[PDB]
Design a protein around this ligand. Structure first.
Ligand code: 77F
Lengths: 99, 99
């Protein structure tokens, strides 16, 4: 679809048979989800945002269906204010900015 | 134009006699610029993201040129690591997400 920006670009994603709302975030390098349980080995990681650095858990090769489009990639889990879909997966679903 | 997301969506913006590189950021409600001594009235504000909150100065009705598109609106000025063009100005240059 085409998504305008007068409202937050929130979409439904499917991860582990759970539906969640996530924000399409072109300013985010990474995909970062609020506290949740995911299967597999994780590696501790640190990432930086506007307010400083946080600790997150890195899960690789995780499938997510973003608004009907399939991705399989790195998902970070941690204390993000909102679930965000970043560039690593935006590229997988063929998302571009247009004006 | 169409901007892919393989790399950070950085573009040239103009605010007075300052050209700067800024992120076209669909995850940002508002525009946040690195510290600069803009003229006129402002109000203090706190904004939050990954890592917590920072203190900014909100300036209203500031003209910005973004990739040669004209915009005018609210700009938040403070100790951000990166210049951020938020949805308030993205809608004004006609910016959409497409996939
Ligand atoms: C109200 O206006 C706002 C409020 C918040 C923000 S925000 O910047 O915090 N922010 C708002 C978001 C924050 C997360 C939850 C939803 C709200 C915009 C976001 O795109 C930032 C941009 C960014 C990039 C690099 C360094 C610092 C910031 N990305 C990131 O925080 C980010 C960058 C690179 C890697 C990464 O893992 C995350 C912007 C405008």
């Amino acid at each position: 679809p085409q998504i305008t920006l007068w409202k937050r670009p929130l979409v439904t994603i499917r991860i582990g048979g759970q539906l969640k709302e996530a924000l399409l975030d072109t300013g985010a390098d990474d995909t970062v989800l609020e506290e949740m349980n995911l299967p597999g080995k994780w590696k501790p990681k640190m990432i930086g945002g506007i307010g400083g650095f946080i600790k997150v858990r890195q899960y690789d090769q995780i499938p997510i269906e973003i608004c009907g489009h399939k991705a399989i990639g790195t998902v970070l889990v941690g204390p993000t204010p909102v679930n965000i879909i970043g560039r690593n997966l935006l590229t997988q679903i063929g998302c571009t900015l247009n004006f």
